[PDB]
């Protein structure tokens, strides 16, 4: 057929930058006057709604993608052909490029966005308009693609099947270890008196491991010869 597909990748990137661009806008509009005082009832309609929806939706979205990928797992993985592995890897690299963008939105944009909103209110509770998106939206999402990528590899690539790359395992699990950080970073002073850094570039390992498989699935021929 062909190895490189990409159709799948675009679906994600497009479906994604759109959903974030909608939100940015919807927060532009309803951030300013609708989510300035939490005690108001237009907060319940415009923010406290989004929260109550997304979590259960996210939580099911996650176990969904999980179960599905496991279910549709290639039961006889070891048998997989050189082309079909190669294709499968390129799908994995794909998941990782979406994981890439999810990481961007969840961890840089909607994260340092929160910085400027702290200069704008005095906080009615921990649920700002910025936290609804940063914490209970942009992160969970970026975390759920993470899981996807992990389970896809596991159920399609012999290497990640019968294994757990530690690198990948990290990647898929440390997002549940940023709340301890980015979150509680906030209840600094309030939670204080009763009293370097653990990070996720685990992707390094993961792409390194992918790379080795490619280097394998090209003979001395393609390898040495075609790319000196």
């Amino acid at each position: 057929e062909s190895v490189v597909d990409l159709r799948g990748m675009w679906i994600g990137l497009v479906l994604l930058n759109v959903f974030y661009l909608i939100v940015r806008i919807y927060e532009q509009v309803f951030g300013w006057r609708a989510g300035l005082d939490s005690f108001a009832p237009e907060f319940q309609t415009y923010w406290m709604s989004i929260l109550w929806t997304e979590i259960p939706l996210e939580l099911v979205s996650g176990l969904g993608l999980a179960g599905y990928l496991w279910k549709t797992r290639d039961r006889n993985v070891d048998a997989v052909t050189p082309r079909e592995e190669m294709r499968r890897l390129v799908v994995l690299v794909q998941w990782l490029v979406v994981y890439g963008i999810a990481i961007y939105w969840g961890a840089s944009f909607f994260t340092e966005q929160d910085g400027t909103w702290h200069m704008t209110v005095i906080r009615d509770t921990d649920f700002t308009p910025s936290h609804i998106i940063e914490f209970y939206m942009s992160y969970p999402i970026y975390s759920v693609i993470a899981v996807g990528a992990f389970f896809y590899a596991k159920t399609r690539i012999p290497y990640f099947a019968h294994g757990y790359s530690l690198a990948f395992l990290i990647v898929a699990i440390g997002p549940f270890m940023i709340i301890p950080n980015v979150g509680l970073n906030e209840w600094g002073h309030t939670f204080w008196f009763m009293e370097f850094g653990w990070m996720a570039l685990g992707v390094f390992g993961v792409v390194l491991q992918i790379l080795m498989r490619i280097h394998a699935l090209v003979g001395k021929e393609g390898v040495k010869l075609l790319t000196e």
Partner: protein, 390 residues
């Protein structure tokens, strides 16, 4: 705009806000409104909050909808940190040029070192016009003028974005000059050195020597442009001067005293009922005209036959009563006061049950027969009474 949510007892037993005033409750873009007032540094300052030895005057607004032109407290220009002594009052004001089209609820606010923000009175202010038109400006020592809303922003880009592009070029150069996969494979087999090796190095050397130069120059020029320059001005300002007129609690010969002697709030409810052993102590008759707490005014409609200008909200007419039996001079009298308003509940002061100190704070305003006012501070242990009916 949080105020409602902050622990009741702290909001009470810290800063007692009064006489708060917004110059103009509408404005044009660039129209110079000014919010002002006075505040009493409670005396039994809670362990919970650090000494206001170090504090900061602010105006509680959703971003810079209004610029601050200048601000003054304790009779000083206060762009920096300032000390408030425990049990004095101070006067303040904030000059506020209008910037953002809209309707913004603007508080007087003060923050404390090891404490956080104390939010006071806030009034809906309304700007009109277009932000487009906003300017300042400001005047440099050397003489000239500059629009802050625009100054420098150009130079920033001018120096950042070139470099950002430079960086981005460096990367792209190598990425298309030995691939990832290629170069990983080169490295993977023996070599490597197929990937790097001069004149890859000579590129580096050149690109480096250029960057050092580009910076030297970049420095030298921006050193010529602006050869003035001083470090950021910072540090705690010389001690403040309190209000001395009159009184103004514990100032002068003329004064009123107030012990609390029990009191009760209904949980849930609207009522606080408190016994006050007042001594007076002036040489005039005095009826109790006002009780302030978290910036809410609780009025006696006897004394306030009408009925002043103060944002809703925040303004009760049921801090009543005594029997309006003007008390003194000389007279040592215990008196019962009822406070009963929806605002007592709406501002969640009724959630003083929740607090790790069940305790009241704030100001009592006595009034004579004429216009004169006499401030005495009230504070202390109030009990709750639990009522059926949610």
């Amino acid at each position: 705009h949080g105020e409602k949510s902050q622990q009741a007892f702290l909001r009470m037993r810290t800063l007692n806000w009064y006489d708060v005033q917004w110059s103009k409750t509408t404005v044009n873009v660039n129209e110079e409104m000014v919010l002002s007032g006075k505040v009493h540094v409670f005396s039994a300052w809670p362990q919970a909050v650090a000494n206001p030895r170090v504090s900061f005057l602010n105006a509680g607004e959703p971003g810079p909808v209004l610029v601050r032109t200048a601000q003054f407290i304790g009779e000083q220009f206060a762009p920096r940190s300032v000390s408030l002594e425990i049990g004095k009052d101070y006067a303040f004001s904030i000059n506020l040029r209008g910037r953002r089209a809209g309707r913004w609820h603007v508080h007087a606010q003060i923050n404390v070192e090891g404490g956080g923000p104390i939010i006071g009175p806030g009034q809906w202010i309304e700007i009109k016009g277009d932000m487009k038109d906003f300017t300042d400006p400001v005047t440099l020592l050397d003489g000239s003028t500059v629009d802050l809303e625009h100054y420098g922003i150009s130079r920033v880009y001018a120096w950042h974005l070139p470099w950002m592009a430079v960086g981005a070029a460096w990367i792209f150069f190598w990425f298309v000059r030995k691939g990832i996969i290629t170069s990983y494979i080169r490295v993977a087999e023996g070599k490597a050195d197929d990937v790097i090796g001069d004149d890859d190095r000579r590129i580096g050397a050149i690109v480096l020597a250029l960057t050092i130069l580009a910076t030297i120059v970049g420095y030298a020029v921006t050193n010529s442009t602006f050869p003035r320059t001083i470090p950021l001005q910072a540090g705690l300002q010389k001690p403040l001067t309190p209000i001395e007129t009159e009184g103004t609690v514990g100032v002068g010969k003329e004064n009123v005293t107030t012990e609390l002697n029990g009191g009760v709030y209904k949980v849930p409810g609207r009522e606080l009922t408190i016994n006050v052993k007042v001594k007076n102590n002036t040489s005039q008759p005095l009826r109790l005209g006002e009780y302030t707490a978290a910036g809410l005014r609780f009025l006696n409609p006897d004394v306030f036959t009408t009925k002043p200008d103060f944002p809703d909200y925040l303004l009760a007419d049921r801090g009543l009563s005594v029997d309006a039996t003007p008390i003194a001079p000389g007279e040592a009298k215990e008196i019962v006061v009822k406070i009963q308003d929806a605002r007592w509940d709406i501002e969640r002061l009724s959630d003083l049950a929740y607090d790790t100190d069940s305790q009241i704070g704030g100001l009592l305003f006595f009034f004579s027969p004429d216009g004169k006012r006499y401030a005495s501070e009230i504070g202390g242990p109030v009990i709750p009474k639990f009522v059926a009916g949610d």
